Design a protein around this ligand. Structure first.
Ligand SMILES: N=C(N)NCCS[C@@H](CC(=O)O)C(=O)O
Ligand SMILES: *[C@@H]1O[C@H](CO)[C@@H](O)[C@H](O)[C@H]1NC(C)=O
Ligand SMILES: [Zn+2]
Length: 383
């Protein structure tokens, strides 16, 4: 069975240990592991993302790009190690274990163990609670990166780390995403704030709330402890919550994904203790293992397709609308691809684009039973 050797030596991987491991994977696995440079922190540390794919050279048409980010708050560390574990796990098992082999073949996966090296470096292993000043939580300038992203409710010069990720997030048609935090145990989804700007305990839901709730439940349902809902003195029905309803915050990465791209990002809290000890890590792995795989496979629900010429040629930046979800259109990729995550049910989908007559609508029955999103294409005539 499984090659999970990465557990035989519980410890937190340093910046050097991380760069070193990502290079090894790249040479260990020439065609499926590739390292991407996103940028650098204030203090020179590399912000890196390991891509895993069927073929790292390109992205197969209609393969969903997805990302996992961790450790944006430097003192919230478990997610960090879990992503380090995932990388090894996927690679070293994908040819041996069918499910995984199939996961990897069908999904374009990016792993970012840390997004705040400087923050991490300043944090102290063992601290369940953050430090004085919230040192380690924010970056080297002590600003909270989860307040530093553009807000949907209203041109860089943010923190290096923010800017890097902003650039990245809009650079590819990411379909699904999650970022990991510590302090509590719960699956949180958009929106994190509202026009009312309420302190807490008031839902600020998303047009795609159903799907979001399905995503959050996918992770929590598969997490033996999160599923409970009464962790760290918190009470979260079904182990999930709306960001805003928990408490509002502005400038977060989560809502930035949704509002400025196609991407559907969840916020996931892994532990009550922000920075637990290594010996804890092997347990955290076994719990989150299923929830991290199953969530990834949620990037396959709904539909996907091509908006194309009469020349049968891809229209980029086309819009694909779903009746009742018209406030969140999908914008096609340069190759005219789109993936529209959907809850089970039946929908009328249509596509439009400037200089093109808006397509006639198509009705589709979305059962999320099969391995890959239902194909559904569009040809548009120029006006
Ligand atoms: N209440 C909302 N909107 N989100 C909770 C998750 S992010 C939060 C908690 C964390 O850092 O883990 C933060 O402070 O950024
Ligand atoms: C994944 O891709 C490999 C190589 O293309 C192929 O041999 C295999 O059938 C695919 N599916 C898996 C690993 O289940
Ligand atoms: Zn956090």
């Amino acid at each position: 069975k499984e090659d999970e050797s990465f557990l035989q030596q519980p410890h937190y991987a340093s910046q050097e240990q991380l760069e070193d491991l990502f290079a090894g994977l790249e040479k260990a696995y020439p065609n499926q592991a590739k390292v991407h440079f996103l940028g650098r922190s204030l203090e020179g540390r590399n912000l890196l993302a390991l891509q895993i794919s069927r073929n790292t050279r390109s992205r197969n048409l209609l393969t969903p790009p997805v990302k996992y980010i961790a450790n944006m708050h430097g003192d919230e560390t478990v997610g960090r190690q879990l992503l380090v574990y995932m990388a090894q796990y996927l690679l070293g098992n994908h040819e041996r274990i069918s499910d995984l082999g199939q996961l990897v073949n069908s999904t374009d996966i990016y792993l970012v163990p840390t997004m705040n090296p400087d923050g991490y470096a300043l944090s102290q292993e063992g601290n369940c609670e953050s430090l004085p000043n919230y040192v380690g939580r924010g970056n080297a300038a002590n600003i909270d990166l989860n307040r530093d992203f553009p807000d949907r409710l209203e041109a860089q010069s943010r923190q290096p780390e923010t800017a890097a990720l902003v650039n990245w997030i809009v650079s590819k048609p990411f379909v699904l995403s999650a970022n990991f935090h510590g302090g509590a145990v719960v699956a949180s989804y958009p929106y994190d704030n509202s026009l009312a700007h309420n302190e807490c305990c008031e839902e600020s839901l998303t047009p795609d709330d159903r799907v979001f709730k399905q995503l959050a439940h996918t992770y929590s349902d598969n997490h033996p402890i999160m599923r409970k809902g009464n962790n760290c003195n918190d009470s979260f029905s079904g182990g999930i919550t709306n960001g805003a309803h928990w408490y509002e915050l502005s400038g977060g990465m989560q809502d930035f994904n949704y509002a400025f791209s196609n991407c559907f990002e969840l916020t996931i809290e892994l532990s009550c203790c922000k920075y637990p000890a290594a010996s804890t890590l092997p347990q955290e792995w076994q719990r989150n293992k299923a929830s991290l795989l199953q969530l990834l496979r949620q990037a396959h629900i709904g539909i996907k397709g091509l908006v194309t010429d009469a020349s049968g040629f891809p229209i980029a930046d086309a819009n694909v609308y779903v009746a009742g979800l018209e406030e969140k259109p999908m914008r096609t990729s340069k190759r005219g691809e789109y993936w529209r995550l959907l809850t089970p049910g039946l929908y009328s989908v249509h596509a439009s684009a400037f200089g093109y007559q808006t397509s006639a609508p198509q009705q589709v029955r979305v059962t999320n039973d099969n391995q890959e999103a239902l194909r559904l294409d569009f040809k548009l005539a120029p006006v």
